[PDB]
Design an enzyme around this catalytic site. Structure first.
Site, PDB file in Angstrom:
ATOM      1  CG  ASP A 255      -1.885   1.007   1.336  1.00 16.18           C
ATOM      2  OD1 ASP A 255      -1.840   1.937   0.529  1.00 16.18           O
ATOM      3  OD2 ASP A 255      -2.762   0.904   2.202  1.00 16.18           O
ATOM      4  CB  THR A 256       2.118   3.471  -2.613  1.00 16.61           C
ATOM      5  OG1 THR A 256       0.937   3.661  -3.400  1.00 16.61           O
ATOM      6  CG2 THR A 256       2.915   2.337  -3.240  1.00 16.61           C
ATOM      7  N   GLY A 257      -0.220   4.208  -0.248  1.00 17.63           N
ATOM      8  CA  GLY A 257      -0.910   5.319   0.369  1.00 17.63           C
ATOM      9  C   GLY A 257      -0.824   5.277   1.897  1.00 17.63           C
TER      10      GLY A 257
HETATM   11  C1  LIG Z   1      -3.875   2.306   7.170  1.00 20.80           C
HETATM   12  C2  LIG Z   1      -3.872   3.769   7.673  1.00 20.80           C
HETATM   13  C3  LIG Z   1      -2.739   4.045   8.671  1.00 20.80           C
HETATM   14  C4  LIG Z   1      -3.693   4.764   6.532  1.00 20.80           C
HETATM   15  N1  LIG Z   1      -3.538   6.109   7.029  1.00 20.80           N
HETATM   16  C5  LIG Z   1      -2.444   6.878   6.779  1.00 20.80           C
HETATM   17  O1  LIG Z   1      -1.457   6.437   6.201  1.00 20.80           O
HETATM   18  N2  LIG Z   1      -2.451   8.155   7.227  1.00 20.80           N
HETATM   19  C6  LIG Z   1      -3.615   8.739   7.910  1.00 20.80           C
HETATM   20  C7  LIG Z   1      -1.290   9.013   7.017  1.00 20.80           C
HETATM   21  C8  LIG Z   1      -1.428   9.809   5.733  1.00 20.80           C
HETATM   22  C9  LIG Z   1      -1.039   9.234   4.504  1.00 20.80           C
HETATM   23  C10 LIG Z   1      -1.187   9.991   3.335  1.00 20.80           C
HETATM   24  C11 LIG Z   1      -1.721  11.278   3.439  1.00 20.80           C
HETATM   25  C12 LIG Z   1      -2.078  11.759   4.701  1.00 20.80           C
HETATM   26  N3  LIG Z   1      -1.933  11.059   5.828  1.00 20.80           N
HETATM   27  C13 LIG Z   1      -4.809   4.743   5.492  1.00 20.80           C
HETATM   28  O2  LIG Z   1      -5.948   4.398   5.725  1.00 20.80           O
HETATM   29  N4  LIG Z   1      -4.407   5.085   4.271  1.00 20.80           N
HETATM   30  C14 LIG Z   1      -5.224   4.889   3.086  1.00 20.80           C
HETATM   31  C15 LIG Z   1      -5.218   6.181   2.242  1.00 20.80           C
HETATM   32  C16 LIG Z   1      -5.604   7.337   3.116  1.00 20.80           C
HETATM   33  C17 LIG Z   1      -4.627   8.182   3.642  1.00 20.80           C
HETATM   34  C18 LIG Z   1      -4.983   9.205   4.523  1.00 20.80           C
HETATM   35  C19 LIG Z   1      -6.312   9.413   4.886  1.00 20.80           C
HETATM   36  C20 LIG Z   1      -7.296   8.582   4.358  1.00 20.80           C
HETATM   37  C21 LIG Z   1      -6.942   7.543   3.480  1.00 20.80           C
HETATM   38  C22 LIG Z   1      -4.705   3.608   2.403  1.00 20.80           C
HETATM   39  O3  LIG Z   1      -3.578   3.882   1.636  1.00 20.80           O
HETATM   40  O4  LIG Z   1      -4.311   2.699   3.379  1.00 20.80           O
HETATM   41  C23 LIG Z   1      -5.753   2.915   1.521  1.00 20.80           C
HETATM   42  F1  LIG Z   1      -6.326   3.881   0.778  1.00 20.80           F
HETATM   43  F2  LIG Z   1      -5.101   2.184   0.590  1.00 20.80           F
HETATM   44  C24 LIG Z   1      -6.809   2.057   2.224  1.00 20.80           C
HETATM   45  C25 LIG Z   1      -6.305   0.673   2.575  1.00 20.80           C
HETATM   46  C26 LIG Z   1      -7.423  -0.053   3.212  1.00 20.80           C
HETATM   47  C27 LIG Z   1      -8.213  -0.915   2.450  1.00 20.80           C
HETATM   48  C28 LIG Z   1      -9.305  -1.554   3.040  1.00 20.80           C
HETATM   49  C29 LIG Z   1      -9.599  -1.318   4.384  1.00 20.80           C
HETATM   50  C30 LIG Z   1      -8.800  -0.459   5.146  1.00 20.80           C
HETATM   51  C31 LIG Z   1      -7.713   0.170   4.563  1.00 20.80           C
HETATM   52  N5  LIG Z   1      -7.980   1.942   1.352  1.00 20.80           N
HETATM   53  C32 LIG Z   1      -9.040   2.738   1.487  1.00 20.80           C
HETATM   54  O5  LIG Z   1      -9.209   3.476   2.452  1.00 20.80           O
HETATM   55  C33 LIG Z   1     -10.007   2.651   0.311  1.00 20.80           C
HETATM   56  N6  LIG Z   1     -10.901   1.515   0.507  1.00 20.80           N
HETATM   57  C34 LIG Z   1     -10.779   0.392  -0.228  1.00 20.80           C
HETATM   58  O6  LIG Z   1      -9.985   0.322  -1.146  1.00 20.80           O
HETATM   59  N7  LIG Z   1     -11.578  -0.659   0.075  1.00 20.80           N
HETATM   60  C35 LIG Z   1     -12.463  -0.730   1.230  1.00 20.80           C
HETATM   61  C36 LIG Z   1     -11.541  -1.833  -0.750  1.00 20.80           C
HETATM   62  C37 LIG Z   1     -10.453  -2.774  -0.302  1.00 20.80           C
HETATM   63  C38 LIG Z   1      -9.106  -2.535  -0.680  1.00 20.80           C
HETATM   64  C39 LIG Z   1      -8.124  -3.457  -0.300  1.00 20.80           C
HETATM   65  C40 LIG Z   1      -8.512  -4.586   0.424  1.00 20.80           C
HETATM   66  C41 LIG Z   1      -9.879  -4.734   0.752  1.00 20.80           C
HETATM   67  N8  LIG Z   1     -10.848  -3.850   0.422  1.00 20.80           N
HETATM   68  C42 LIG Z   1     -10.793   3.940   0.083  1.00 20.80           C
HETATM   69  C43 LIG Z   1      -9.842   5.129  -0.103  1.00 20.80           C
HETATM   70  C44 LIG Z   1     -11.742   3.845  -1.129  1.00 20.80           C
END
Ligand SMILES: CC(C)[C@H](NC(=O)N(C)Cc1ccccn1)C(=O)N[C@@H](Cc1ccccc1)C(O)(O)C(F)(F)[C@H](Cc1ccccc1)NC(=O)[C@@H](NC(=O)N(C)Cc1ccccn1)C(C)C
EC number: 3.4.23.16
Lengths: 99, 99
Positions: free
Chosen positions: B25-27
């Site tokens: 996950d690069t995000g």
């Molecule tokens: C795992 C967390 C720690 C992480 N947070 C994070 O890194 N930060 C808050 C720091 C940050 C990073 C970048 C910018 C700002 N701040 C996170 O959720 N980061 C996500 C992007 C994001 C960044 C910031 C704010 C909101 C979203 C993410 O990269 O992990 C993601 F987008 F890939 C996450 C990974 C994920 C998938 C499924 C469930 C839970 C998590 N995906 C999602 O949130 C996406 N959902 C999604 O893709 N789903 C539900 C389908 C799915 C995918 C894979 C497997 C199963 N199901 C939506 C954006 C549509």
């Protein structure tokens, strides 16, 4: 381009004539942008992530340019903390992960 | 290897000597694993994502192997739907996005 991951992979996109910054995100199935006016009809959808579900509007067949590469596809607009470019549009521009 | 993004980038990791599956996950800034008991003390932490925050336990100096490449770093454990390998470990294995 080859992007390393020491910093967040944020790039410039062009959307609706507007420039914005967005995260290239391989973990996301979909593209989610922060709230904005796009031309066209939309329908409500929910999408989820860590924490829960949000309500977004879905717009279909929207033209976007990511670093100069065109993609045409679905874009969700809603109260996202950050603009996310997900796999629906990453595959269009030919993106891969390599190591 | 090179990973296309037509499907979610799920790979096998080894953590404590067992195989699990996890999303590259690069995000994500951080690595977030499904609930497990690790030996070691931890620190409480809250992490956010699309829909809100959850609570996790932070362990330091965890060794993982992602597809045969070792990395050593912080892991957050809590009730995630998916195991997520974020940038903190992706940089250690030499991962790039290419288009
Ligand atoms: C795992 C967390 C720690 C992480 N947070 C994070 O890194 N930060 C808050 C720091 C940050 C990073 C970048 C910018 C700002 N701040 C996170 O959720 N980061 C996500 C992007 C994001 C960044 C910031 C704010 C909101 C979203 C993410 O990269 O992990 C993601 F987008 F890939 C996450 C990974 C994920 C998938 C499924 C469930 C839970 C998590 N995906 C999602 O949130 C996406 N959902 C999604 O893709 N789903 C539900 C389908 C799915 C995918 C894979 C497997 C199963 N199901 C939506 C954006 C549509």
């Amino acid at each position: 381009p080859q992007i390393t991951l020491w910093q967040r992979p944020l790039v410039t996109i062009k959307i609706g004539g507007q420039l914005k910054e967005a995260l290239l995100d391989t973990g996301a199935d979909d593209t989610v942008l922060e709230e904005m006016s796009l031309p066209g009809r939309w329908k409500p959808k929910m999408i989820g992530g860590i924490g829960g579900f949000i309500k977004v509007r879905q717009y279909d067949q929207i033209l976007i340019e990511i670093c100069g590469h065109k993609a045409i596809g679905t874009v969700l607009v809603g109260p996202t903390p950050v603009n996310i470019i997900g796999r629906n549009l990453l595959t269009q521009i030919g993106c891969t992960l390599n190591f």
